Design a binder for this molecule. Structure first.
Ligand code: MG
Ligand code: ZN
Ligand code: ZN
Ligand code: ZN
Ligand code: ZN
Ligand code: ZN
Lengths: 107, 112, 167, 196, 99, 62, 144, 118, 97, 171, 662, 56
């Protein structure tokens, strides 16, 4: 996790993709003054493991494309460091059933 | 959080004049609007661009252009949608069509 | 599964072993497994149909020269098959008139004779059906036999089938 | 009389309240397409005319026009016109050499009826003969006819009551019309009350 | 099973708020057969309240949102609904509510 | 068929023959089919073939 | 001679030729007047342009004109392409003569029936071997 | 035609407004026998839905109106829908419902075993 | 009388699928048309009295099905064929749900 | 040519046959539309084997007709002709265009152009036949013919035969 | 009579596969080659062979059979023809896609400009969906102006690897109307790229190449985007209308096809007899324009093809798009049979689920009832009654599908009905009918009622059902729809019935309530001052249809037997109903008589108002339909309306100018 | 527009809310699986009041 100050030069940004499995994440300091997860609108995001994702797809008889999506530029997705194909269980308050657990796959 | 804010705005519009709508309808609207990872508008360039079947998409707007881009891309319409079965005049798999009725031979001999 | 047109195909020809996509050598039965295509000669088909008809007659009850055979199969068809049996009656009289072998022993002998030849199921029943007398006659009546069976083996098969042929 | 309906007096209707005349004029011209393709105002016969309408032609005169005063009913021919065809064809089975013409007659409207008020024969600018037939009928008010005050208070007749069923004052006066109170306060039509 | 519990936890909160031991014995004064009748009827009315599969809830939602619109400082009403359904980068009265 | 000016092959002629097993009847006109000349002039085409080839003989030799 | 391709509406139960046939247009049926059996249902009672195949023949042509968004360059080339057609020269001159018929009748305030009669008389007398050397104005005048 | 000031909205005519704003798997595969979920592990509701009840009544009444054998003692009833409702009342309808899961799999529920609570 | 689009939507909201099929087919336009199994096009010559079906091009006579579609749907498909688009109608699935 | 095949047929049972013994109506209706029926895909179907156990699937009620559509799977003996195969038979009819030979349940037409030129028609003799210098081809006469072309419609099969090849004709 | 029986299996369309015709497939499926622009013959009375109305294409006359399928009007679907174009032309709806593919592929050897040797190209090929992958490929390759016959190696940029390229410079392609022009890079020379050149280059595109562009090998090749064999739609697509059954006005598509044929013949004659390249280009541009306007007349930057009258030619795209197109005006919605429309009027004496149907509408609309042993006698009586008397019948459909009109059949004698026959009888009482008010915004605006045949010309309906319909009686009209089968009749009454829609899912509250005069009279009836004498009490009690026959003990026994209005309204309320609502200042004693207390279906206190019997949550309607069911709630609607309307009839209520005066 | 965007949304037999493609919109309908017509407004008695009133 590289926490820069103002900007990344594109000559240095192009080599941010590096040799697998090493992953580099760049965060701006102005975007990280306030933790977005503590906001009341942002619900609880929990990254699922591979076996949890497989069980979720099996029990609902789902494919990958049939899940709700979260993009790989979403601020919570960048907060959790989501890679493509990772499913987060989103637990949120519901005014009809108290607790509700949705799922979103990272595209 | 965008979905929650969208629900709050839709609820404010609905209850601005005192009208009350049950939560699940607005929840379904904001869940369809946010199911693709971003705010998908209810427009010709929003839901109508999702690959949900060419005959469904041509029913809303840009009929001939969508049929052209389906012919060029050789799109296979699986006819699971309501509009496809409405066009083809067969019973849509909705409501009473959401199942099949089959005659039971084992209970037929049991009755008498 | 592809929905391609694939409207071009070779014509069904018995000479080039082309019997159509629904008469291939391998057939998927009702149980799902691959099984060899069943082809009957004229004597075997008569026995198969007669056994099926007497089995149907037995199921309904529980719930030789050519002249005396024709009346028996006629009354069997009348008491077993309902309407629209004219094609079946014509088939039964065709199999009765053109019958090289009479009993199931001769038919089974022909089957075990032709099971060691290693030929196609279509052509062995053609060999058992046609009363060929010459190996060249069998080669020109059945064009699939060219470069498939030796002449002396074909002559032996024809003379042994002629020996097993009765009435 | 709820939800803008009104109760009309049937006895008042019987005496002519809101009874109206209705006139409808039918225009027809015989046009000359060419030499032999010309139309003729005539009374067609089933023997020599093809594609005849199933309505009656008996009310027509020799000129193919019904005289004024004759009562007409639904899908009845009021103007009779025929056009020539090509002889010796084969269509619809009922085609013979006698059928030299087809029917181009003008029937009445399928639901309308009435009395022929006036039949007018003349020529157009081109000199072709053309006719105008006026049919006159009563429109007697019934259930569903639309009536309005002079204040935006429209509505249909819900039902008609006779005089002995209507409410009456101590002077024996019964209304010709009963309208609902609930049409007044939301619409704020005070001028209806002041006008009354 | 977790989804089932999350679906019924709010109604179970209501049920525990109503069918508490203090409220049954003191306020409602129910007997044994009355309590059994209450439990059976709550179960039956719950199982009758579940949405039937095959229900076209999308068209139901669309009509249930569109019809109150037909009976309709910051913008509100039909233009605000149009600016919501059309996801527009601009709007007449963008605003914050800072606490 | 001389009436409707339509061709019919020998394969589809047999499916159109009458109950008397004597004539082939038309599908539309119900008229007895007349025989074409596909094969009577075939040798003539071969003759035409011959009458081309010597005529094209200086071309192939060049 | 030629294929029949003719449909006759005959009752298969009354077996009366010719049959008494009523075309119930309101109910969209063709019925036998004797037994009431229907023969053809869903009968056919605007979208194109009127064209009589007796005055100008079986000529079907459409012209090119300015639309809502039209460039001037494309219209002129298409007009010159339509004009430079050799197979409709007889059609072009007979339409020019019909335009002259309408111009002369409209300059006389003659009724429309005179225009139609003169047009069909010119069409019937057109392209005649006995009528080739006469002036066009004489043909015009005699047709009028 | 007519000239009326009685404003009648043209219906299904939103194209006027449209022209106003035009600018802005793992468990089952193919069609094998694994499509049929076995009876011991059926996860659908044991209650007959309103759509299931409506289509069972319609199908049974259509069959009864075409001389199907009636499996209940008629009390003089002649209407096929009432006869079908009588058959459903005491579970004498010999039909099953093939409830289709979204992945193409299905569960077979007999009408006799489904609880008609509605 | 127009059974319009949003009438269809209200009948969808009821879940009355068979009534929706009946309004669009048995009340307005129910057209039977034959299609071959090889190509989904409607170009099948069908002599019902002679019981002979044939699709030229595919040259098949034993792979024909009949379907009941609206006449407006048939007109749509023929207009699409006139616009060089193939609305190939097939009577079986090719991909899993 | 005689084969034994496994065939599946869709049978639409009317609701009037929804009795306790519906299976025997389905089996009886199976025979009446299969025994002796001609299908161009599988040839002339002659007899149904394995009648004691026939795979009957669960029938689906048609959503607008009310009839039940069953997919009955059965094992039956069929007779499917092919081009280029040699079959025996007896002549049932003769004419100037040719003679029809009955092989199995099928009538193969032997055209006049597909015989040796020694054969010629003779309508004077009763019954009319073809006479050659070495043999005659009359009604109810054994003849061996090679099928060179077969046309198969949805419900009919017609074949074209020849006797021009050596070791054919009368036996 | 329906359609003739067909031995083909009856199947439903499960999949619709889109694609483009090959030029081979157009000629393969064609039954005729169209060669003459004329439609009529030289006698103007038969159809010209080889013309636009060739009889092999089908017949649009009731008396003419199709030449190909030998069927009539109602059975023949029409058969396609084909026109062999002299020069290939662009498809008008594919011009932008042709230009994008032209920018993607090479204009010299027909190969993709960028291959897997490029890093940014490999990730473009990895995109799964065809449209996004094609867009990425086009955006990447639009700036590449060279075929790149030699490219740097992927593993290291030190050695050069040669792909199958020519190295030629790809021109910039831009559109000017119906043609594409390419400008090669100056070391710009601009020239028009001919459609035959584009077709030849598209033919050379490999299978792997256009598959990366999103084109299927079997169904839509890019070479099929160029039109060289135009399909000709049958006369069912373009029928010849009649203005007075003597004119032979043709469709606009027939005129466009005639123009296309004239342009094709002109181009063939110009090519065969020799012409300058300007004339050939002009003729092929005219042919391209005619084909384009035949498929799309409204093109931006193009002249519109006009008719003789000056109106624009209705192209196929104009026939498909819009609310009047085939999709929205003919498929998504359509005009239907077995439907009726008239003015609606209110009727307090009808039930909640009843519609008052006019007798003429009842005699017109029919239901086909299948003959059973249970209704042989009633259907025989209805057949004997005939179509001119309600109740009666209009048609008898036999088991063979033949339909006998009951007019023109009484002279033939009586008809013996067999089992399995259908009798199209007039709709009778308690027939489920769909009843609808347009615009019909929600599902409660289209509900199922039961017929009550009435002797007047308006639809009659209950007053409480006007709120879900948004219906007034100032001239409103509502549509009726009659189901024609037992399945639709059954699911109409089990899903769409009016009592089942009492509680709306929109706001989880009732949408039907006591309204207008019944609401005013139910407030006036349940005041404390409202006492009812014995005769009027008995008349009220008899007006309740399910009244059990016991007269309630009066609220006042002495010195005069007087019943309160709450007491008599409680008779309409079913037993076992408990309601409790406290308004402002409402106690167990109600000095203002506000609030509401109902115990065992008996009103204890509270004036009954909009908060009780209106369409409000927690009201009497909601409680009754949740505790007793929808049918009991509909009966409650009827009972309350009857008793309150009787009381307000014999009590009266007015309003006047003096009510506006303070 | 709202109807056309939502015309394929259906509650399936696993109680998931899916479109024509089978994409899950809601894993249970309305987040509670309830028909809207069978819903009434009720008071949650535990959330309100004081702690002393809650204990009493
Ligand atoms: Mg109104
Ligand atoms: Zn012919
Ligand atoms: Zn008759
Ligand atoms: Zn095909
Ligand atoms: Zn045809
Ligand atoms: Zn190149």
């Amino acid at each position: 996790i590289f926490v820069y100050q103002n900007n990344i030069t594109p000559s240095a940004m192009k080599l941010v993709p590096s040799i697998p499995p090493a992953t580099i994440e760049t965060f701006n300091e102005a975007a990280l003054v306030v933790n977005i997860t503590h906001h009341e609108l942002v619900p609880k995001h929990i990254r699922l493991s591979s076996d949890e994702k497989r069980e979720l797809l099996k029990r609902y008889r789902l494919k990958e494309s049939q899940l709700p999506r979260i993009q790989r530029a979403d601020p919570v997705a960048l907060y959790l460091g989501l890679k493509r194909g990772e499913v987060v269980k989103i637990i949120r308050k519901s005014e009809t059933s108290g607790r509700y657990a949705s799922y979103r796959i990272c595209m | 959080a965008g979905r929650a804010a969208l629900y709050k705005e839709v609820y404010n519009v609905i209850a601005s004049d005192g009208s009350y709508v049950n939560y699940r309808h607005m929840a379904l609207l904001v869940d369809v609007m946010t199911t693709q990872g971003g705010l998908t508008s209810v427009t010709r360039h929003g839901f109508n661009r999702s690959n949900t079947g060419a005959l469904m998409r041509c029913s809303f707007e840009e009929t001939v252009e969508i049929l052209f881009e389906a012919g060029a891309s050789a799109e296979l319409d699986d006819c699971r949608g309501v509009s496809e079965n409405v066009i083809l005049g067969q019973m849509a798999p909705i409501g009473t069509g959401a199942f099949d009725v089959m005659i039971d031979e084992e209970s037929l001999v049991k009755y008498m | 599964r592809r929905r391609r047109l694939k409207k071009v195909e070779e014509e069904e020809n018995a000479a080039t072993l082309q019997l159509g996509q629904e008469f291939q050598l391998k057939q998927i039965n009702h149980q799902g497994e691959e099984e060899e295509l069943i082809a009957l000669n004229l004597s075997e088909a008569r026995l198969v149909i007669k056994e099926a008809l007497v089995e149907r007659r037995r199921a309904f009850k529980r719930s030789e020269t050519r002249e005396k055979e024709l009346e028996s199969i006629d009354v069997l068809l009348e008491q077993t098959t309902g309407g629209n049996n004219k094609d079946l009656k014509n088939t039964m009289q065709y199999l009765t008139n053109f019958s090289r072998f009479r009993d199931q022993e001769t038919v089974g002998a022909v089957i075990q004779l032709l099971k060691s030849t290693g030929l196609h199921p279509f052509e062995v029943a053609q060999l058992g059906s046609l009363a060929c007398d010459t190996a060249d006659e069998a080669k020109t009546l059945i064009p699939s036999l060219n470069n498939k069976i030796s002449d002396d083996e074909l002559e032996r098969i024809l003379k042994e089938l002629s020996n097993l042929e009765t009435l | 009389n709820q939800e803008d309906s009104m109760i009309m007096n049937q006895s008042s209707i019987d005496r002519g309240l809101f009874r109206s005349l209705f006139f409808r004029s039918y225009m027809d011209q015989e046009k000359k397409y060419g030499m032999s393709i010309t139309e003729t105002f005539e009374k067609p016969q089933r023997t020599n005319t093809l594609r005849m309408k199933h309505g009656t032609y008996d009310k027509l005169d020799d000129d193919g026009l019904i005289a004024p005063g004759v009562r007409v009913s639904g899908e009845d021919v009021i103007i009779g016109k025929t056009t020539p065809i090509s002889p010796d064809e084969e269509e619809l089975g009922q085609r013979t050499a006698y059928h030299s013409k087809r029917d181009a007659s003008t029937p009445l409207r399928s639901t309308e009826n009435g009395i022929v008020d006036q039949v007018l024969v003349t020529t157009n600018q081109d000199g072709l003969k053309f006719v105008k037939v006026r049919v006159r009928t009563t429109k007697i008010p019934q259930i569903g006819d639309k009536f309005a005050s002079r204040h935006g208070q429209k509505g249909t007749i819900g039902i008609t009551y006779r005089r002995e069923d209507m409410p009456f004052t101590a002077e024996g006066i019964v209304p010709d019309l009963i309208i609902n109170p609930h049409a007044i306060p939301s619409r704020m039509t005070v001028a209806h009350l002041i006008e009354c | 099973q977790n989804a089932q519990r999350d679906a019924v936890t709010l109604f179970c909160c209501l049920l525990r708020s109503r069918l508490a031991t203090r409220r049954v014995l003191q306020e409602y004064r129910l007997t044994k057969q009355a309590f059994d009748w209450v439990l059976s009827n709550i179960e039956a009315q719950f199982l009758r309240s579940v949405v039937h599969p095959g229900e076209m809830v999308g068209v139901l939602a669309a009509q249930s949102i569109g019809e109150p619109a037909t009976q309709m400082k910051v913008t509100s009403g039909v233009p605000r609904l149009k600016e919501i359904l059309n996801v527009a980068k601009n709007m007449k009265t963008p605003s914050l509510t800072v606490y | 068929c001389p009436i409707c000016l339509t061709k019919y092959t020998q394969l589809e002629a047999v499916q159109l023959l009458n109950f008397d097993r004597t004539e082939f009847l038309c599908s539309l006109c119900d008229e007895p089919l007349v025989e074409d000349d596909s094969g009577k002039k075939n040798k003539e085409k071969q003759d035409k073939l011959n009458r081309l080839m010597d005529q094209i003989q200086p071309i192939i030799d060049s | 001679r030629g294929p029949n391709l003719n449909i006759v509406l005959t009752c298969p139960e009354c077996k009366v030729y010719p049959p008494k046939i009523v075309e119930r247009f309101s109910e969209g049926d063709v019925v036998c007047a004797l037994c009431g059996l229907v023969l053809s249902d869903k009968l056919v009672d605007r979208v194109g342009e009127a064209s009589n195949p007796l005055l100008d023949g079986n000529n079907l042509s459409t012209r090119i004109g300015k639309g809502e968004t039209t460039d001037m360059r494309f219209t002129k080339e298409l007009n010159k392409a339509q004009g430079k057609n050799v197979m409709d020269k007889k059609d072009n001159e007979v339409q020019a003569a019909f335009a002259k018929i309408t111009m002369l009748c409209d300059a006389a305030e003659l009724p429309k029936i005179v225009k139609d009669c003169a047009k069909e008389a010119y069409k019937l007398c057109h392209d005649e071997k006995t009528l080739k050397g006469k002036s066009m104005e004489s043909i015009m005048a005699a047709s009028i | 035609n007519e000239n009326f000031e009685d404003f009648d909205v043209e219906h299904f005519s939103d194209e006027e407004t449209y022209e106003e704003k035009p600018q802005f798997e793992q468990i089952r595969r193919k069609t094998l026998k694994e499509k049929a979920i076995p009876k011991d592990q059926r996860a659908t509701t044991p209650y007959m839905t309103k759509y299931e009840r409506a289509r069972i009544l319609g199908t049974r009444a259509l069959q009864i109106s075409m001389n199907a054998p009636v499996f209940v003692d008629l009390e003089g009833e002649t209407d096929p829908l009432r006869i079908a409702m009588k058959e459903l009342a005491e579970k004498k309808i010999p039909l099953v419902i093939r409830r289709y899961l979204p992945d193409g799999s299905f569960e077979d529920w007999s009408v006799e075993e489904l609880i008609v609570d509605l | 009388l127009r059974f319009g689009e949003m009438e269809r939507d209200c009948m969808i909201a009821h879940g009355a699928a068979s009534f929706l099929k009946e309004r669009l087919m048995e009340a307005s336009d129910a057209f039977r048309v034959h299609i071959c199994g090889i190509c989904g096009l409607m170009t099948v010559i069908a002599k019902l009295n002679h019981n002979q079906f044939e699709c030229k091009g595919c040259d098949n006579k034993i792979d024909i099905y009949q379907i009941h579609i609206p006449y407006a749907a048939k007109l749509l498909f023929q207009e699409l064929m006139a616009m060089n688009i193939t609305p190939r109608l097939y009577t079986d699935r090719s991909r899993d749900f | 040519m005689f084969f034994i095949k496994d065939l599946s047929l869709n049978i639409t049972l009317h609701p009037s046959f929804f009795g306790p013994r519906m299976k025997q109506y389905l089996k009886t209706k199976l025979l009446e539309e299969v025994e002796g029926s001609c299908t161009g895909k599988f040839g002339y179907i002659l007899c149904v084997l394995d009648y004691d156990n026939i795979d009957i699937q669960r029938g689906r009620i048609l959503p607008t007709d009310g009839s039940a559509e069953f997919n009955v799977k059965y094992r039956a003996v069929v007779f499917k002709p092919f081009k280029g195969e040699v079959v025996d038979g007896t002549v049932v009819s003769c004419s100037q265009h040719g003679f029809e030979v009955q092989v199995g349940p099928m009538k193969v037409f032997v055209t006049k152009h597909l015989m040796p030129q020694d054969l010629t028609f003779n309508a004077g003799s009763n019954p009319p036949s073809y006479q050659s210098s070495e043999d005659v081809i009359t009604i109810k006469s054994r003849i061996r013919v090679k099928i060179e072309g077969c046309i198969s419609q949805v419900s009919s099969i017609h074949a074209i035969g020849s006797i021009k090849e050596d070791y054919l004709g009368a036996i | 009579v329906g359609q003739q029986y067909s031995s083909a299996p009856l199947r439903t369309v499960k999949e619709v596969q889109f694609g483009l015709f090959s030029p081979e497939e157009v000629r393969a499926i064609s039954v005729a080659k169209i060669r003459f622009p004329e439609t009529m013959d030289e006698t103007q009375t038969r159809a010209k062979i080889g013309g636009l109305n060739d009889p092999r294409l089908g017949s649009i006359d009731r008396n003419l059979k199709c030449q190909t399928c030998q069927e009539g009007m109602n059975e023949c679907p029409g058969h396609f023809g084909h026109i062999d174009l002299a020069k290939p032309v662009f498809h008008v709806g594919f011009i932008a896609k042709i230009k994008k593919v032209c920018e993607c592929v090479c204009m010299h050897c027909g190969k993709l400009l960028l291959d897997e040797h490029n890093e940014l190209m490999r990730q473009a090929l990895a995109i799964k969906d065809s449209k996004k992958r094609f867009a990425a490929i086009w955006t990447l390759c639009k700036t590449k102006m060279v075929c790149e016959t030699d490219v740097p190696s992927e593993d290291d940029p030190t050695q050069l690897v040669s792909r199958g390229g020519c190295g030629n410079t790809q021109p910039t392609i831009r559109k000017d109307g119906l043609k594409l022009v390419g400008s090669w890079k100056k070391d710009p020379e601009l020239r028009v790229l001919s459609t035959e050149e584009i077709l030849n280059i598209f033919k050379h595109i490999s299978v792997k190449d256009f598959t990366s562009l999103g084109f299927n090998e079997v169904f839509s090749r890019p070479e099929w985007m160029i039109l060289t064999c135009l399909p000709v739609p049958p006369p069912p697509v373009r029928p010849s209308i009649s203005f007075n059954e003597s004119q032979r006005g043709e469709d606009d598509l027939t005129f466009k096809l005639a123009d296309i044929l004239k342009a094709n013949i002109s181009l063939e004659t110009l090519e065969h007899n020799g012409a300058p390249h300007h004339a050939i280009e002009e003729a092929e541009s005219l042919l391209q324009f005619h084909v384009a306007t035949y498929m799309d007349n409204d093109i931006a930057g193009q002249p519109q093809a006009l008719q003789k009258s000056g109106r624009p030619v209705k192209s196929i795209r104009a026939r498909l798009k819009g609310k009047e197109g085939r999709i929205r005006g003919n498929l998504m919605g359509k005009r239907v049979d077995f439907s009726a429309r008239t003015v609606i009027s209110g009727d307090p004496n009808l039930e909640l689920d009843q519609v008052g149907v006019p007798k003429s509408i009842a005699k017109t609309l029919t239901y086909p009832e299948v003959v059973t042993p249970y209704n042989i006698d009633r259907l025989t009586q209805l057949v004997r009654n005939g179509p001119n008397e309600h109740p009666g019948a209009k048609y008898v459909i036999r088991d063979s599908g033949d339909r006998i009109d009951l007019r023109y059949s009484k002279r033939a004698g009586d008809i013996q009905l067999q089992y399995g026959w259908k009798v199209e009888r007039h709709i009778m009482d308690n027939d489920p009918v769909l009843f609808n008010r347009q615009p019909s915004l929600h599902k409660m605006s289209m509900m199922a009622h039961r017929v009550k045949v009435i002797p007047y010309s308006t639809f009659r309906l209950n007053l409480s059902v006007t709120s879900p319909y948004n219906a007034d009686f100032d001239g409103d009209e509502m549509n009726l729809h009659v189901p024609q089968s037992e399945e639709t009749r059954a699911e109409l009454s089990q899903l769409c019935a009016v009592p089942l829609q009492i509680v709306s899912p929109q706001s989880n509250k009732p949408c039907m309530g006591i309204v207008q005069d019944t609401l005013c009279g139910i407030r006036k009836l349940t005041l404390r001052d409202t006492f009812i004498e014995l005769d009027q009490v008995l008349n009220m009690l008899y007006w309740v249809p399910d009244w059990d026959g016991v007269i309630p003990t009066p609220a006042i026994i002495k010195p005069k037997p007087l019943w309160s209005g709450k007491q008599i309204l409680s008779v309409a309320i079913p037993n076992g109903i408990h309601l409790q609502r406290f308004d402002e200042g409402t106690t167990l004693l109600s000095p203002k008589d506000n609030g509401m207390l109902i115990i065992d279906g008996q009103i204890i206190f509270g004036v009954v108002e909009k908060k009780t019997v209106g369409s409000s949550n927690g009201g009497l309607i909601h409680v009754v339909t949740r505790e007793k069911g929808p049918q009991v709630c509909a009966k409650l609607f009827g009972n309350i309306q009857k008793v309150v309307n009787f009381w307000l009839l014999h009590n009266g209520f007015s309003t006047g100018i003096g009510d506006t005066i303070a | 527009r709202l109807v056309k965007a939502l015309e394929d949304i259906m509650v399936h037999y696993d109680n998931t809310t899916r479109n024509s493609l089978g994409n899950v919109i809601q894993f249970i309908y309305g987040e509670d699986g309830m028909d809207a017509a069978h819903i009434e407004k009720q008071s949650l008695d535990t959330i309100g009041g004081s702690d002393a009133a809650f204990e009493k």
